[PDB]
Tab-separated table of N, CA and C in Angstrom:
chain	number	residue	atom	x	y	z
L	1062	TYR	N	-158.316	20.997	-117.071
L	1062	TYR	CA	-157.103	21.164	-117.861
L	1062	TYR	C	-156.788	19.907	-118.665
L	1084	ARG	N	-135.868	-17.488	-141.198
L	1084	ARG	CA	-135.072	-18.442	-140.434
L	1084	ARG	C	-135.866	-19.714	-140.159
L	1085	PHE	N	-136.900	-19.932	-140.967
L	1085	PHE	CA	-137.769	-21.091	-140.809
L	1085	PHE	C	-136.977	-22.392	-140.897
L	1086	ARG	N	-137.528	-23.436	-140.287
L	1086	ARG	CA	-136.926	-24.763	-140.269
L	1086	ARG	C	-137.739	-25.703	-141.146
L	1087	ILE	N	-137.049	-26.459	-141.996
L	1087	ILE	CA	-137.675	-27.402	-142.915
L	1087	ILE	C	-137.414	-28.816	-142.416
L	1088	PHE	N	-138.412	-29.682	-142.568
L	1088	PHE	CA	-138.319	-31.083	-142.183
L	1088	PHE	C	-138.883	-31.941	-143.305
L	1089	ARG	N	-138.283	-33.111	-143.513
L	1089	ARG	CA	-138.692	-34.008	-144.583
L	1089	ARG	C	-138.288	-35.427	-144.212
L	1090	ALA	N	-138.624	-36.370	-145.082
L	1090	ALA	CA	-138.233	-37.756	-144.898
L	1090	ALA	C	-137.015	-38.068	-145.765
L	1091	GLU	N	-136.529	-39.302	-145.654
L	1091	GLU	CA	-135.372	-39.725	-146.431
L	1091	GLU	C	-135.691	-39.698	-147.921
L	1092	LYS	N	-134.703	-39.286	-148.719
L	1092	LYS	CA	-134.904	-39.206	-150.162
L	1092	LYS	C	-135.194	-40.572	-150.769
L	1093	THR	N	-134.686	-41.645	-150.158
L	1093	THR	CA	-134.925	-42.980	-150.691
L	1093	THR	C	-136.376	-43.415	-150.537
L	1094	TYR	N	-137.123	-42.799	-149.623
L	1094	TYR	CA	-138.529	-43.123	-149.421
L	1094	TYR	C	-139.447	-42.443	-150.428
L	1095	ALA	N	-138.901	-41.894	-151.511
L	1095	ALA	CA	-139.727	-41.228	-152.508
L	1095	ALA	C	-140.693	-42.217	-153.150
L	1096	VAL	N	-141.807	-41.691	-153.650
L	1096	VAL	CA	-142.859	-42.504	-154.242
L	1096	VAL	C	-143.071	-42.073	-155.685
L	1097	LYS	N	-143.462	-43.034	-156.523
L	1097	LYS	CA	-143.719	-42.768	-157.930
L	1097	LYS	C	-145.074	-43.259	-158.417
L	1098	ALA	N	-145.846	-43.958	-157.589
L	1098	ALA	CA	-147.148	-44.454	-158.007
L	1098	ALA	C	-148.006	-44.699	-156.777
L	1099	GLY	N	-149.317	-44.635	-156.972
L	1099	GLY	CA	-150.265	-44.921	-155.915
L	1099	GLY	C	-150.785	-43.673	-155.233
L	1100	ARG	N	-151.472	-43.910	-154.118
L	1100	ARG	CA	-152.086	-42.860	-153.316
L	1100	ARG	C	-151.455	-42.876	-151.933
L	1101	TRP	N	-150.876	-41.748	-151.531
L	1101	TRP	CA	-150.163	-41.646	-150.264
L	1101	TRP	C	-150.729	-40.495	-149.444
L	1102	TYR	N	-151.007	-40.761	-148.169
L	1102	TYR	CA	-151.679	-39.811	-147.295
L	1102	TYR	C	-150.980	-39.773	-145.945
L	1103	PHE	N	-150.796	-38.566	-145.412
L	1103	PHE	CA	-150.159	-38.417	-144.109
L	1103	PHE	C	-150.723	-37.205	-143.381
L	1104	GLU	N	-150.584	-37.217	-142.057
L	1104	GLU	CA	-151.171	-36.200	-141.200
L	1104	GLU	C	-150.111	-35.245	-140.664
L	1105	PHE	N	-150.522	-33.995	-140.466
L	1105	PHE	CA	-149.680	-32.959	-139.878
L	1105	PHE	C	-150.515	-32.214	-138.847
L	1106	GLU	N	-150.156	-32.359	-137.578
L	1106	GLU	CA	-150.833	-31.687	-136.480
L	1106	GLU	C	-150.053	-30.442	-136.086
L	1107	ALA	N	-150.783	-29.393	-135.721
L	1107	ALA	CA	-150.187	-28.133	-135.289
L	1107	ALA	C	-150.985	-27.614	-134.104
L	1108	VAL	N	-150.343	-27.536	-132.934
L	1108	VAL	CA	-150.992	-26.972	-131.751
L	1108	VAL	C	-151.092	-25.461	-131.813
L	1109	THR	N	-150.329	-24.832	-132.693
L	1109	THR	CA	-150.327	-23.394	-132.864
L	1109	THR	C	-150.934	-23.050	-134.217
L	1110	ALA	N	-151.020	-21.749	-134.497
L	1110	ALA	CA	-151.590	-21.271	-135.752
L	1110	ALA	C	-150.659	-20.284	-136.445
L	1111	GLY	N	-149.362	-20.375	-136.172
L	1111	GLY	CA	-148.399	-19.438	-136.715
L	1111	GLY	C	-148.010	-19.785	-138.134
L	1112	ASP	N	-146.756	-19.507	-138.468
L	1112	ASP	CA	-146.263	-19.682	-139.832
L	1112	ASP	C	-145.893	-21.141	-140.019
L	1113	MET	N	-146.725	-21.897	-140.742
L	1113	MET	CA	-146.513	-23.327	-140.937
L	1113	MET	C	-146.979	-23.712	-142.332
L	1114	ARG	N	-146.103	-24.377	-143.080
L	1114	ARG	CA	-146.425	-24.895	-144.399
L	1114	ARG	C	-146.259	-26.407	-144.403
L	1115	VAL	N	-147.103	-27.083	-145.178
L	1115	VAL	CA	-147.036	-28.538	-145.286
L	1115	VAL	C	-147.340	-28.939	-146.724
L	1116	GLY	N	-146.643	-29.964	-147.209
L	1116	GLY	CA	-146.866	-30.411	-148.568
L	1116	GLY	C	-145.936	-31.520	-149.007
L	1117	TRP	N	-145.701	-31.614	-150.312
L	1117	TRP	CA	-144.864	-32.661	-150.879
L	1117	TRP	C	-143.829	-32.026	-151.793
L	1118	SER	N	-142.561	-32.341	-151.555
L	1118	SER	CA	-141.461	-31.797	-152.333
L	1118	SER	C	-140.762	-32.914	-153.090
L	1119	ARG	N	-139.909	-32.518	-154.010
L	1119	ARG	CA	-139.049	-33.463	-154.695
L	1119	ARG	C	-137.730	-33.596	-153.951
L	1120	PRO	N	-137.061	-34.751	-154.057
L	1120	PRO	CA	-135.782	-34.924	-153.354
L	1120	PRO	C	-134.649	-34.127	-153.978
L	1121	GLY	N	-134.900	-32.845	-154.223
L	1121	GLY	CA	-133.859	-31.907	-154.579
L	1121	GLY	C	-134.120	-30.538	-153.987
L	1122	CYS	N	-135.120	-30.429	-153.116
L	1122	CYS	CA	-135.544	-29.123	-152.632
L	1122	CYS	C	-134.536	-28.549	-151.641
L	1123	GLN	N	-134.458	-27.214	-151.601
L	1123	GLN	CA	-133.454	-26.523	-150.794
L	1123	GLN	C	-133.886	-26.492	-149.335
L	1124	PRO	N	-132.978	-26.738	-148.387
L	1124	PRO	CA	-133.337	-26.626	-146.970
L	1124	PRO	C	-133.342	-25.198	-146.448
L	1125	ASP	N	-133.024	-24.213	-147.285
L	1125	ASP	CA	-133.027	-22.813	-146.884
L	1125	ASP	C	-133.977	-21.940	-147.688
L	1126	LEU	N	-134.344	-22.346	-148.898
L	1126	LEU	CA	-135.241	-21.556	-149.725
L	1126	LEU	C	-136.682	-21.681	-149.233
L	1127	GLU	N	-137.533	-20.786	-149.732
L	1127	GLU	CA	-138.954	-20.830	-149.408
L	1127	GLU	C	-139.544	-22.172	-149.817
L	1128	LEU	N	-140.299	-22.784	-148.909
L	1128	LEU	CA	-140.909	-24.078	-149.189
L	1128	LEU	C	-141.984	-23.911	-150.254
L	1129	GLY	N	-141.684	-24.345	-151.474
L	1129	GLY	CA	-142.630	-24.309	-152.570
L	1129	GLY	C	-142.371	-23.235	-153.601
L	1130	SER	N	-141.577	-22.211	-153.278
L	1130	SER	CA	-141.373	-21.096	-154.199
L	1130	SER	C	-140.655	-21.496	-155.481
L	1131	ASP	N	-140.160	-22.724	-155.582
L	1131	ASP	CA	-139.465	-23.195	-156.770
L	1131	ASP	C	-140.234	-24.383	-157.352
L	1132	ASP	N	-139.691	-24.969	-158.419
L	1132	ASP	CA	-140.307	-26.111	-159.085
L	1132	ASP	C	-139.999	-27.429	-158.393
L	1133	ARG	N	-139.580	-27.380	-157.131
L	1133	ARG	CA	-139.133	-28.555	-156.399
L	1133	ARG	C	-140.036	-28.894	-155.221
L	1134	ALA	N	-141.172	-28.215	-155.082
L	1134	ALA	CA	-142.065	-28.459	-153.961
L	1134	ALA	C	-143.447	-27.913	-154.283
L	1135	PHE	N	-144.463	-28.560	-153.716
L	1135	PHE	CA	-145.846	-28.097	-153.776
L	1135	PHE	C	-146.387	-28.146	-152.355
L	1136	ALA	N	-146.704	-26.987	-151.784
L	1136	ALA	CA	-147.047	-26.926	-150.370
L	1136	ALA	C	-148.349	-26.161	-150.175
L	1137	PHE	N	-148.698	-25.951	-148.909
L	1137	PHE	CA	-149.866	-25.172	-148.528
L	1137	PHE	C	-149.587	-24.525	-147.181
L	1138	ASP	N	-149.938	-23.245	-147.065
L	1138	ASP	CA	-149.744	-22.469	-145.845
L	1138	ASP	C	-151.103	-21.964	-145.381
L	1139	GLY	N	-151.525	-22.394	-144.189
L	1139	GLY	CA	-152.792	-21.953	-143.647
L	1139	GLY	C	-152.749	-20.614	-142.948
L	1140	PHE	N	-151.558	-20.154	-142.557
L	1140	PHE	CA	-151.426	-18.832	-141.955
L	1140	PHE	C	-151.946	-17.736	-142.876
L	1141	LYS	N	-151.941	-17.974	-144.187
L	1141	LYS	CA	-152.567	-17.080	-145.146
L	1141	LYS	C	-153.562	-17.795	-146.048
L	1142	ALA	N	-153.791	-19.091	-145.838
L	1142	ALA	CA	-154.725	-19.892	-146.629
L	1142	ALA	C	-154.387	-19.812	-148.118
L	1143	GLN	N	-153.183	-20.275	-148.447
L	1143	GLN	CA	-152.668	-20.176	-149.806
L	1143	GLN	C	-151.883	-21.429	-150.163
L	1144	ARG	N	-152.150	-21.973	-151.347
L	1144	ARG	CA	-151.312	-23.030	-151.892
L	1144	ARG	C	-150.017	-22.425	-152.417
L	1145	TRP	N	-148.911	-23.133	-152.205
L	1145	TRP	CA	-147.579	-22.594	-152.443
L	1145	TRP	C	-146.909	-23.350	-153.579
L	1146	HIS	N	-146.528	-22.602	-154.607
L	1146	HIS	CA	-145.842	-23.048	-155.812
L	1146	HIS	C	-144.969	-21.879	-156.256
L	1147	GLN	N	-144.587	-21.845	-157.533
L	1147	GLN	CA	-143.888	-20.672	-158.057
L	1147	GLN	C	-144.909	-19.539	-158.097
L	1148	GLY	N	-145.092	-18.912	-156.943
L	1148	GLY	CA	-146.196	-18.010	-156.688
L	1148	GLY	C	-147.149	-18.576	-155.649
L	1149	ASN	N	-148.089	-17.731	-155.235
L	1149	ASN	CA	-149.060	-18.109	-154.219
L	1149	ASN	C	-150.470	-17.833	-154.719
L	1150	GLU	N	-151.363	-18.793	-154.490
L	1150	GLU	CA	-152.764	-18.679	-154.873
L	1150	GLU	C	-153.621	-18.944	-153.646
L	1151	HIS	N	-154.617	-18.089	-153.422
L	1151	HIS	CA	-155.503	-18.256	-152.277
L	1151	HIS	C	-156.254	-19.577	-152.383
L	1152	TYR	N	-156.005	-20.474	-151.433
L	1152	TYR	CA	-156.577	-21.813	-151.464
L	1152	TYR	C	-156.926	-22.245	-150.049
L	1153	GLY	N	-158.138	-22.762	-149.873
L	1153	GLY	CA	-158.559	-23.254	-148.580
L	1153	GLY	C	-158.738	-22.146	-147.554
L	1154	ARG	N	-158.897	-22.578	-146.306
L	1154	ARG	CA	-159.099	-21.681	-145.182
L	1154	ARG	C	-157.986	-21.866	-144.160
L	1155	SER	N	-157.902	-20.918	-143.232
L	1155	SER	CA	-156.903	-20.975	-142.180
L	1155	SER	C	-157.317	-21.973	-141.103
L	1156	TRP	N	-156.349	-22.360	-140.279
L	1156	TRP	CA	-156.590	-23.235	-139.142
L	1156	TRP	C	-156.468	-22.438	-137.847
L	1157	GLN	N	-156.607	-23.142	-136.724
L	1157	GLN	CA	-156.473	-22.522	-135.412
L	1157	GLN	C	-155.508	-23.310	-134.536
L	1158	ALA	N	-155.471	-22.984	-133.246
L	1158	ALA	CA	-154.589	-23.677	-132.317
L	1158	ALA	C	-155.120	-25.078	-132.040
L	1159	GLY	N	-154.297	-26.089	-132.311
L	1159	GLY	CA	-154.676	-27.463	-132.045
L	1159	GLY	C	-155.480	-28.096	-133.160
L	1160	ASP	N	-154.968	-28.024	-134.385
L	1160	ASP	CA	-155.652	-28.552	-135.556
L	1160	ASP	C	-154.793	-29.608	-136.239
L	1161	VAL	N	-155.402	-30.313	-137.195
L	1161	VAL	CA	-154.718	-31.322	-137.992
L	1161	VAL	C	-155.051	-31.085	-139.458
L	1162	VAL	N	-154.158	-31.545	-140.330
L	1162	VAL	CA	-154.354	-31.448	-141.772
L	1162	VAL	C	-153.847	-32.730	-142.417
L	1163	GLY	N	-154.654	-33.290	-143.326
L	1163	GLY	CA	-154.302	-34.496	-144.032
L	1163	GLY	C	-153.921	-34.185	-145.463
L	1164	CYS	N	-152.751	-34.668	-145.869
L	1164	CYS	CA	-152.256	-34.520	-147.228
L	1164	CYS	C	-152.472	-35.842	-147.951
L	1165	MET	N	-153.041	-35.776	-149.154
L	1165	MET	CA	-153.187	-36.941	-150.013
L	1165	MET	C	-152.644	-36.606	-151.393
L	1166	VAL	N	-151.834	-37.504	-151.943
L	1166	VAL	CA	-151.279	-37.338	-153.280
L	1166	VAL	C	-151.505	-38.623	-154.059
L	1167	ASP	N	-152.141	-38.498	-155.219
L	1167	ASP	CA	-152.363	-39.601	-156.141
L	1167	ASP	C	-151.462	-39.385	-157.347
L	1168	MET	N	-150.547	-40.330	-157.572
L	1168	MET	CA	-149.585	-40.238	-158.660
L	1168	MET	C	-150.103	-40.814	-159.969
L	1169	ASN	N	-151.116	-41.681	-159.924
L	1169	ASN	CA	-151.676	-42.214	-161.159
L	1169	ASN	C	-152.507	-41.175	-161.900
L	1170	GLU	N	-153.004	-40.154	-161.199
L	1170	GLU	CA	-153.721	-39.053	-161.829
L	1170	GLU	C	-153.098	-37.690	-161.565
L	1171	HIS	N	-152.007	-37.621	-160.797
L	1171	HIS	CA	-151.293	-36.371	-160.514
L	1171	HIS	C	-152.203	-35.346	-159.828
L	1172	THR	N	-152.777	-35.745	-158.691
L	1172	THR	CA	-153.677	-34.861	-157.949
L	1172	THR	C	-153.277	-34.802	-156.483
L	1173	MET	N	-153.221	-33.589	-155.940
L	1173	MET	CA	-152.927	-33.354	-154.533
L	1173	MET	C	-154.156	-32.761	-153.856
L	1174	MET	N	-154.429	-33.202	-152.630
L	1174	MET	CA	-155.577	-32.732	-151.873
L	1174	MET	C	-155.192	-32.541	-150.413
L	1175	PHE	N	-155.863	-31.584	-149.774
L	1175	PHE	CA	-155.636	-31.226	-148.381
L	1175	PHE	C	-156.977	-31.208	-147.666
L	1176	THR	N	-157.039	-31.832	-146.491
L	1176	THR	CA	-158.250	-31.846	-145.675
L	1176	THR	C	-157.933	-31.305	-144.290
L	1177	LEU	N	-158.555	-30.185	-143.931
L	1177	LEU	CA	-158.371	-29.579	-142.616
L	1177	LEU	C	-159.404	-30.165	-141.660
L	1178	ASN	N	-158.949	-31.045	-140.764
L	1178	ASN	CA	-159.814	-31.704	-139.785
L	1178	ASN	C	-160.956	-32.449	-140.476
L	1179	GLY	N	-160.603	-33.229	-141.497
L	1179	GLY	CA	-161.573	-33.986	-142.256
L	1179	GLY	C	-162.364	-33.194	-143.273
L	1180	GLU	N	-162.258	-31.868	-143.270
L	1180	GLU	CA	-162.975	-31.027	-144.221
L	1180	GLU	C	-162.074	-30.775	-145.423
L	1181	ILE	N	-162.489	-31.273	-146.590
L	1181	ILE	CA	-161.699	-31.088	-147.800
L	1181	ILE	C	-161.641	-29.611	-148.157
L	1182	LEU	N	-160.439	-29.131	-148.458
L	1182	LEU	CA	-160.248	-27.733	-148.801
L	1182	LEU	C	-160.802	-27.442	-150.189
L	1183	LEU	N	-161.293	-26.217	-150.365
L	1183	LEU	CA	-161.854	-25.767	-151.629
L	1183	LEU	C	-161.030	-24.613	-152.178
L	1184	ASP	N	-160.873	-24.591	-153.495
L	1184	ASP	CA	-160.175	-23.514	-154.178
L	1184	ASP	C	-161.172	-22.439	-154.615
L	1185	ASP	N	-160.684	-21.433	-155.338
L	1185	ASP	CA	-161.557	-20.355	-155.787
L	1185	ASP	C	-162.441	-20.785	-156.949
L	1186	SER	N	-161.968	-21.716	-157.772
L	1186	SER	CA	-162.725	-22.229	-158.903
L	1186	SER	C	-163.718	-23.313	-158.500
L	1187	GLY	N	-163.915	-23.533	-157.205
L	1187	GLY	CA	-164.837	-24.560	-156.753
L	1187	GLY	C	-164.378	-25.972	-157.046
L	1188	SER	N	-163.083	-26.243	-156.904
L	1188	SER	CA	-162.531	-27.567	-157.147
L	1188	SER	C	-161.736	-28.017	-155.930
L	1189	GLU	N	-162.016	-29.234	-155.459
L	1189	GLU	CA	-161.304	-29.781	-154.311
L	1189	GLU	C	-159.835	-30.038	-154.612
L	1190	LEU	N	-159.475	-30.177	-155.883
L	1190	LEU	CA	-158.092	-30.435	-156.257
L	1190	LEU	C	-157.233	-29.199	-156.023
L	1191	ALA	N	-156.019	-29.421	-155.522
L	1191	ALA	CA	-155.074	-28.332	-155.291
L	1191	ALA	C	-154.090	-28.185	-156.454
L	1192	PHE	N	-153.319	-29.235	-156.742
L	1192	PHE	CA	-152.354	-29.242	-157.832
L	1192	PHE	C	-152.666	-30.376	-158.799
L	1193	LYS	N	-152.333	-30.159	-160.068
L	1193	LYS	CA	-152.658	-31.105	-161.124
L	1193	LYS	C	-151.670	-30.917	-162.264
L	1194	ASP	N	-151.446	-32.002	-163.012
L	1194	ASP	CA	-150.530	-32.024	-164.158
L	1194	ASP	C	-149.120	-31.585	-163.758
L	1195	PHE	N	-148.479	-32.435	-162.966
L	1195	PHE	CA	-147.075	-32.279	-162.624
L	1195	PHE	C	-146.313	-33.553	-162.958
L	1196	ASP	N	-145.077	-33.387	-163.413
L	1196	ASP	CA	-144.258	-34.526	-163.781
L	1196	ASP	C	-143.823	-35.292	-162.538
L	1197	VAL	N	-143.797	-36.620	-162.658
L	1197	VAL	CA	-143.383	-37.445	-161.533
L	1197	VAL	C	-141.914	-37.197	-161.221
L	1198	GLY	N	-141.107	-36.987	-162.251
L	1198	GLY	CA	-139.695	-36.754	-162.036
L	1198	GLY	C	-139.060	-37.981	-161.420
L	1199	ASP	N	-138.594	-37.836	-160.182
L	1199	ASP	CA	-137.972	-38.925	-159.447
L	1199	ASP	C	-138.698	-39.273	-158.154
L	1200	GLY	N	-139.770	-38.561	-157.811
L	1200	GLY	CA	-140.549	-38.899	-156.636
L	1200	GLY	C	-141.017	-37.701	-155.838
L	1201	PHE	N	-141.929	-37.931	-154.895
L	1201	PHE	CA	-142.433	-36.883	-154.018
L	1201	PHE	C	-142.291	-37.340	-152.577
L	1202	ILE	N	-141.689	-36.494	-151.750
L	1202	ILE	CA	-141.462	-36.809	-150.345
L	1202	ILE	C	-142.232	-35.797	-149.502
L	1203	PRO	N	-142.861	-36.216	-148.406
L	1203	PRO	CA	-143.536	-35.249	-147.533
L	1203	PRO	C	-142.553	-34.238	-146.964
L	1204	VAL	N	-143.058	-33.035	-146.691
L	1204	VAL	CA	-142.216	-31.937	-146.240
L	1204	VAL	C	-143.068	-30.964	-145.441
L	1205	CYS	N	-142.460	-30.381	-144.410
L	1205	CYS	CA	-143.106	-29.381	-143.578
L	1205	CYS	C	-142.109	-28.270	-143.280
L	1206	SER	N	-142.638	-27.103	-142.921
L	1206	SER	CA	-141.817	-25.938	-142.621
L	1206	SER	C	-142.464	-25.150	-141.495
């Protein structure tokens, strides 16, 4: 028979040189990391405006006004290095020492952005 945003002090903004910092994540959930301007919203999407340039590995996408598939995803217990060069306006991301690649075969993530008043590290 409801994401949380974290950043540094606005006075620590940079306008020249090469600046690099690390972001470790023991998990692989919703996490974005990048560089914002000292006017970015603490409640808006990290990067969805002209005030931040980020990267989200949960979908392997660089984050700007829109999303573009960039790099690869991470896993539990990984690190990512952010580098920003202001003399040439270039941002780069390295997942565990491996430089991320875009679809056009270029290691560069963002290019040709105005310095404005500075770039501060930011995570979400």
